[PDB]
Amino acid sequence: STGKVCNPDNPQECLLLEPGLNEIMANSLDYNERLWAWESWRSEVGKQLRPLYEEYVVLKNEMARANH
Amino acid sequence: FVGWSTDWSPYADQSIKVRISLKSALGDKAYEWNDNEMYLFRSSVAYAMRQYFLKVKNQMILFGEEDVRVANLKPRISFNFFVTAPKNVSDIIPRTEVEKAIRMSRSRINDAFRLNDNSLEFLGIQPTLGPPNQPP
Amino acid sequence: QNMNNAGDKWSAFLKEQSTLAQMYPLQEIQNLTVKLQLQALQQNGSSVLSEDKSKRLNTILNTMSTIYSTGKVCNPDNPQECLLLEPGLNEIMANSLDYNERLWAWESWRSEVGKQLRPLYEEYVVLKNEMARANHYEDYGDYWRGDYEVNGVDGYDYSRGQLIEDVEHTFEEIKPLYEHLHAYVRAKLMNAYPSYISPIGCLPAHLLGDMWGRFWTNLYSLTVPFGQKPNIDVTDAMVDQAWDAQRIFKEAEKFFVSVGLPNMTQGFWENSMLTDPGNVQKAVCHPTAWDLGKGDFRILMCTKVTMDDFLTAHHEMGHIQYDMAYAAQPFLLRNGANEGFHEAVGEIMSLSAATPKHLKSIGLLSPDFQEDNETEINFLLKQALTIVGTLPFTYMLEKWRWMVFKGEIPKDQWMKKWWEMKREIVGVVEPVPHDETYCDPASLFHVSNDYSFIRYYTRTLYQFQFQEALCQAAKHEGPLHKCDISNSTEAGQKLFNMLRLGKSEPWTLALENVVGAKNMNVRPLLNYFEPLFTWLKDQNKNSFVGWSTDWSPYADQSIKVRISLKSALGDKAYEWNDNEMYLFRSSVAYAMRQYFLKVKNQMILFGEEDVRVANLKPRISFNFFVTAPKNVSDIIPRTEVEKAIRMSRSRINDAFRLNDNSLEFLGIQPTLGPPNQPP
Amino acid sequence: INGFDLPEGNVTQENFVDMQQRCNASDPAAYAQLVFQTCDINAFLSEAVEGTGLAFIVFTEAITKMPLSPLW
Numbered sequence: 001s002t003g004k005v006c007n008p009d010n011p012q013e014c015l016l017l018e019p020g021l022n023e024i025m026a027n028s029l030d031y032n033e034r035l036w037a038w039e040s041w042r043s044e045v046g047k048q049l050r051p052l053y054e055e056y057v058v059l060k061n062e063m064a065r066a067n068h
Numbered sequence: 069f070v071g072w073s074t075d076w077s078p079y080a081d082q083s084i085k086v087r088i089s090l091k092s093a094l095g096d097k098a099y100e101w102n103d104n105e106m107y108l109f110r111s112s113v114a115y116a117m118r119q120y121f122l123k124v125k126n127q128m129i130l131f132g133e134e135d136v137r138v139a140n141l142k143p144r145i146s147f148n149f150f151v152t153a154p155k156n157v158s159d160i161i162p163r164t165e166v167e168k169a170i171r172m173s174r175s176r177i178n179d180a181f182r183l184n185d186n187s188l189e190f191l192g193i194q195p196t197l198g199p200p201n202q203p204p
Numbered sequence: 205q206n207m208n209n210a211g212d213k214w215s216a217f218l219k220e221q222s223t224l225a226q227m228y229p230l231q232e233i234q235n236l237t238v239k240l241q242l243q244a245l246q247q248n249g250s251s252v253l254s255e256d257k258s259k260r261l262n263t264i265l266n267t268m269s270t271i272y273s274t275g276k277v278c279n280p281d282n283p284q285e286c287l288l289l290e291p292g293l294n295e296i297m298a299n300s301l302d303y304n305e306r307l308w309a310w311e312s313w314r315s316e317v318g319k320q321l322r323p324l325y326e327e328y329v330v331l332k333n334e335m336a337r338a339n340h341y342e343d344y345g346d347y348w349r350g351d352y353e354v355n356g357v358d359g360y361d362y363s364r365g366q367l368i369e370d371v372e373h374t375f376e377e378i379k380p381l382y383e384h385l386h387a388y389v390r391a392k393l394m395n396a397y398p399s400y401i402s403p404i405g406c407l408p409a410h411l412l413g414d415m416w417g418r419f420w421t422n423l424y425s426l427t428v429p430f431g432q433k434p435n436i437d438v439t440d441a442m443v444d445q446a447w448d449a450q451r452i453f454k455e456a457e458k459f460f461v462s463v464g465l466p467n468m469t470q471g472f473w474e475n476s477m478l479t480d481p482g483n484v485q486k487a488v489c490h491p492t493a494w495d496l497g498k499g500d501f502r503i504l505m506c507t508k509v510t511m512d513d514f515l516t517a518h519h520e521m522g523h524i525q526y527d528m529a530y531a532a533q534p535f536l537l538r539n540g541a542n543e544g545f546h547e548a549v550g551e552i553m554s555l556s557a558a559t560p561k562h563l564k565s566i567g568l569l570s571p572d573f574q575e576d577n578e579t580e581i582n583f584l585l586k587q588a589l590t591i592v593g594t595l596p597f598t599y600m601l602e603k604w605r606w607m608v609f610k611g612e613i614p615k616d617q618w619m620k621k622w623w624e625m626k627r628e629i630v631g632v633v634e635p636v637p638h639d640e641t642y643c644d645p646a647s648l649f650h651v652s653n654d655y656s657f658i659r660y661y662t663r664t665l666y667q668f669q670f671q672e673a674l675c676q677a678a679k680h681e682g683p684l685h686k687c688d689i690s691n692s693t694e695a696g697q698k699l700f701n702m703l704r705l706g707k708s709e710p711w712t713l714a715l716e717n718v719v720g721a722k723n724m725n726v727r728p729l730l731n732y733f734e735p736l737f738t739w740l741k742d743q744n745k746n747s748f749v750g751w752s753t754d755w756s757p758y759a760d761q762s763i764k765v766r767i768s769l770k771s772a773l774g775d776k777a778y779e780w781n782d783n784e785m786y787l788f789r790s791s792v793a794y795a796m797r798q799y800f801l802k803v804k805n806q807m808i809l810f811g812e813e814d815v816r817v818a819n820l821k822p823r824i825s826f827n828f829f830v831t832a833p834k835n836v837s838d839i840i841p842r843t844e845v846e847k848a849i850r851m852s853r854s855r856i857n858d859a860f861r862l863n864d865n866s867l868e869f870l871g872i873q874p875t876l877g878p879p880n881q882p883p
Numbered sequence: 884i885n886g887f888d889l890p891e892g893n894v895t896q897e898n899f900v901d902m903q904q905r906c907n908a909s910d911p912a913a914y915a916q917l918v919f920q921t922c923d924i925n926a927f928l929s930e931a932v933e934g935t936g937l938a939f940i941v942f943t944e945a946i947t948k949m950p951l952s953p954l955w
């Protein structure tokens with residue numbers, strides 16, 4: 001909810017997902033701008049979530065086996 | 069046509085295939101190909117791209133190892149790679165210019181890995197030059 | 205835009221009347237008053253450039269101003285918390301006592317912002333040099349030095365090149381006092397950051413109390429001479445007598461009447477913002493004095509009941525008394541004599557109102573109170589952290605900008621000359637090395653917002669010249685720092701004969717109406733801090749006074765490299781450009797990744813940006829050290845980098861076609877190999 | 884070269900003595916730790932070896948620096 005992505009040419013304008021990065025993916029017809037928003041969202045957020053999720057899966061499998 | 073083929077890719081026509089034969093160039097005295105050797109390979113390609121744009125086009129473009137995108141890694145030791153602009157993922161450098169940059173620095177990439185031009189092949193870049201005019 | 209439609213109405217009236225002023229050349233005017241107004245009106249400014257060069261320059265100036273105010277820096281561990289400079293990153297550099305947190309905020313501010321400003325500023329300098337040459341100046345620094353120029357007033361002249369010689373002349377006399385303050389602060393900082401500061405070297409740049417080391421005033425809680433004695437503060441006696449924000453402006457009004465200056469203006473007493481409203485009525489609280497015209501003088505400040513808001517009232521009312529004195533002058537000649545006189549008159553009022561001799565007669569500071577000679581040392585060292593600690597910084601920065609504008613520093617040597625002048629003049633060393641991708645001077649406000657900086661040097665020298673001359677007319681007996689000019693009408697007459705001039709006369713003549721000389725002088729500043737200079741020389745008996753420009757915070761974990769290309773190859777030898785240094789930083793980062801995987805079984809993602817290179821030479825030599833991947837405070841120790849290089853030395857040699865004698869590491873020698881040939 | 888940071892092919896035999904004084908006029912107290920040699924021919928040609936050393940410690944040292952050492 002708080003991770004944001006900013007522009008290569010202007011690093012002072014950073015967009016959150018829920019306003020601004022969704023309106024690019026819903027309204028733009030520019031191939032290059034849609035590819036920037038798709039890939040740069042997966043980068044940072046992507047990686048953080050990576051280790052987080054790994055730990056998550058591990059812990060979640062222990063709760064379910066103790067409930068048979 | 070109804071249906072899809074799982075082989076086409078948006079980056080597949082600007083990729084170059086690499087094939088590495090470690091146990092034929094060395095045999096024994098041969099190292100193991102981990103992820104640290106792929107980092108050195110992405111740095112030698114980024115070195116070779118910086119030199120070509122400086123001596124042919126007189127531009128200074130700061131290519132990094134993160135601009136060399138590697139796909140389809142196998143045990144035989146093969147992968148595809150393409151090169152993008154330093155912070156513009158939409159700008160793929162064309163394949164005919166990456167072929168000229170690799171030709172300029174092929175002897176320098178071979179020495180960094182102890183391979184010699186037949187155990188490090190690029191599949192579409194073949195070595196050309198060299199007259200054997202020995203006797204005077 | 206109720207004021208922008210009035211402001212653009214005024215900005216356009218000037219350029220209409222400026223072209224009409226071109227009809228009267230200056231070689232025929234004999235009257236000096238009508239000549240001085242025409243010089244202010246005939247100057248072209250940026251109206252002399254091309255039509256698309258004048259809009260390229262205004263775009264760079266708006267871009268550099270926006271990167272400064274909106275650029276932010278976030279945390280390595282949590283990338284979602286980003287801090288701006290003006291809140292949050294200044295409070296780290298002013299309050300933290302953690303070496304690692306201060307080093308993060310210092311370095312990460314210079315990175316991003318640094319680089320952007322780099323190219324911006326390059327373009328900037330280029331464009332700025334074209335505007336000044338079309339206005340018949342040498343460069344843009346000569347344009348800035350034209351505020352101090354006097355031409356042909358028969359014995360009061362002053363060149364634009366004479367300001368460079370008078371600044372360097374007065375600076376060589378402040379240098380003994382600054383070295384004893386430098387050596388005292390260094391010894392006290394060694395008790396706060398042990399094993400980080402050398403007892404004979406420079407001071408690390410991130411430990412100085414703010415982001416740039418412009419003032420050393422936040423170092424007072426670490427460097428106080430007698431910590432158990434408190435300073436004189438009357439912020440609690442003002443509440444016991446219930447002083448509101450109208451009595452403290454009536455006390456400032458009585459201070460100026462006592463020296464002979466007039467009262468306020470009824471209109472003034474009527475209009476003013478002497479207190480904060482508090483409700484949804486908004487407004488700016490910065491303390492400002494206003495000179496709206498036709499006898500309208502107003503002051504706007506959110507006035508609390510504190511000791512320094514009592515002092516700021518004396519400072520701002522000195523600006524009003526200066527504006528009230530040249531109100532009989534023409535409109536173009538209504539300012540100070542130069543840019544430094546206006547803020548120097550305001551600071552000798554708050555200097556004389558803060559003395560305990562003054563406060564015990566105003567109603568505060570109970571009448572049986574004898575001040576100790578240990579609180580006078582506490583008072584003087586707090587003054588020297590702000591006054592004396594800023595003078596080598598101010599001199600070095602304008603000297604760097606004056607030489608960049610005239611071309612004596614080439615564009616590939618901007619950052620190399622910046623840190624050589626900081627180690628030599630200021631005694632301050634960088635904690636990490638910086639190449640020509642940085643623009644560390646442009647990370648200050650005044651550099652990226654296009655302001656001259658020599659006015660803060662000359663104002664400091666005029667301030668003690670005015671105070672020493674006004675305390676001789678008031679017949680002061682003891683030291684200069686206890687002086688009070690109140691109840692002396694003959695001292696308020698020497699001040700008023702300079703106050704009433706404005707820019708009607710040269711500034712060399714307005715000095716002689718007060719101090720009895722024509723040039724700026726540094727001996728009254730040295731007489732002010734004379735009881736502190738005696739005490740500092742006794743505290744520095746066993747210490748070393750001075751600094752060596754060779755010690756560095758990263759110098760004991762560096763490794764020297766030496767490369768001999770034409771001996772290993774001879775011919776068939778390549779040229780060592782910056783692309784070969786990138787491959788060298790990648791081979792060291794490769795060698796660090798392999799050592800931590802096969803000896804310690806950790807996966808640490810070293811990059812080429814973690815290999816920090818310093819001291820590059822033609823022979824082909826440099827020093828390098830390796831840091832953690834995104835932690836600049838974590839330097840990998842040298843004995844572990846020596847083991848990583850030994851493991852992969854044959855692999856680094858093959859990448860460059862060198863063989864172990866043309867690529868040496870100076871402390872890593874090859875060992876192994878028995879020559880047991882025959883069976 | 885290891886003390887004054889000069890290029891490689893810098894300061895050959897033709898320019899030894901003039902580049903000795905360019906360094907000490909550039910910066911003193913860095914020439915005082917430099918150890919130079921006073922080696923010159925007619926001192927390397929003038930050893931008095933005789934009787935067995937002209938074949939076992941003089942002639943066989945010059946053979947090792949030739950092209951085909953184990954044939955000469």
Ligand SMILES: *[C@@H]1O[C@H](CO)[C@@H](O[C@@H]2O[C@H](CO)[C@@H](O)[C@H](O)[C@H]2NC(C)=O)[C@H](O)[C@H]1NC(C)=O
Pocket residue numbers: 008009032156157158159160
């Ligand atoms: C990133 O690279 C792409 C090229 O793939 C750039 O796109 C070009 O943009 C210009 C104007 O913006 C167009 O006239 C070109 O037609 C575009 N190229 C293509 C192939 O469509 C894009 O501008 C680059 N982005 C940045 C920030 O430099």
Ligand SMILES: *[C@@H]1O[C@H](CO)[C@@H](O[C@@H]2O[C@H](CO)[C@@H](O)[C@H](O)[C@H]2NC(C)=O)[C@H](O)[C@H]1NC(C)=O
Pocket residue numbers: 235236237238
């Ligand atoms: C320079 O010119 C100004 C006019 O612009 C002169 O000022 C006038 O001086 C006379 C007598 O000194 C006064 O009666 C006028 O009122 C002044 N004019 C204004 C507008 O105030 C000034 O005297 C001239 N200077 C010299 C040295 O002749």
Ligand SMILES: *[C@@H]1O[C@H](CO)[C@@H](O[C@@H]2O[C@H](CO)[C@@H](O)[C@H](O)[C@H]2NC(C)=O)[C@H](O)[C@H]1NC(C)=O
Pocket residue numbers: 223226246247248252339
């Ligand atoms: C200010 O700029 C102008 C450029 O417009 C300079 O040139 C004068 O321009 C006027 C037209 O407004 C002409 O009538 C003059 O002949 C021009 N002078 C010259 C020497 O070409 C003007 O000289 C500049 N003024 C100053 C004081 O620098």
Ligand SMILES: *[C@@H]1O[C@H](CO)[C@@H](O[C@@H]2O[C@H](CO)[C@@H](O)[C@H](O)[C@H]2NC(C)=O)[C@H](O)[C@H]1NC(C)=O
Pocket residue numbers: 462562565566690691
């Ligand atoms: C300036 O001088 C006046 C008078 O010489 C001082 O006013 C006297 O203050 C003392 C104590 O502060 C009182 O006992 C007297 O009654 C006051 N005299 C009058 C006539 O009111 C004033 O304090 C002096 N100001 C300073 C700053 O020294």
Ligand SMILES: *[C@@H]1O[C@H](CO)[C@@H](O[C@@H]2O[C@H](CO)[C@@H](O)[C@H](O)[C@H]2NC(C)=O)[C@H](O)[C@H]1NC(C)=O
Pocket residue numbers: 577578581739
């Ligand atoms: C403040 O003044 C006092 C008294 O003049 C000084 O104290 C004396 O200093 C001398 C010098 O070493 C000693 O010999 C005496 O024994 C001290 N007197 C006492 C009672 O201890 C003091 O040094 C002064 N402090 C400053 C900072 O100047």
Ligand SMILES: *[C@@H]1O[C@H](CO)[C@@H](O[C@@H]2O[C@H](CO)[C@@H](O)[C@H](O)[C@H]2NC(C)=O)[C@H](O)[C@H]1NC(C)=O
Pocket residue numbers: 280281304835836837838839
């Ligand atoms: C960056 O590296 C420094 C080491 O230089 C780390 O500082 C250590 O922090 C721990 C707890 O935070 C202390 O117990 C150690 O004493 C510190 N080391 C030193 C030498 O003082 C710092 O934590 C690292 N930062 C990150 C984000 O990992």
Ligand SMILES: *[C@@H]1O[C@H](CO)[C@@H](O)[C@H](O)[C@H]1NC(C)=O
Pocket residue numbers: 461466467
């Ligand atoms: C200043 O104003 C006060 C009234 O507030 C008046 O008594 C005093 O005489 C005035 N000062 C002078 C110099 O007239």
Ligand SMILES: *[C@@H]1O[C@H](CO)[C@@H](O)[C@H](O)[C@H]1NC(C)=O
Pocket residue numbers: 890892893894
């Ligand atoms: C040695 O260095 C000097 C200094 O620039 C240079 O002028 C000279 O050409 C160099 N000598 C050689 C042989 O390169």
Ligand SMILES: *[C@@H]1O[C@H](CO)[C@@H](O)[C@H](O)[C@H]1NC(C)=O
Pocket residue numbers: 904907908914
């Ligand atoms: C530099 O050293 C040499 C060697 O002793 C000496 O002859 C020469 O005078 C020195 N240079 C100067 C300027 O003293």
Ligand SMILES: [Zn+2]
Pocket residue numbers: 491492493
């Ligand atoms: Zn002010």
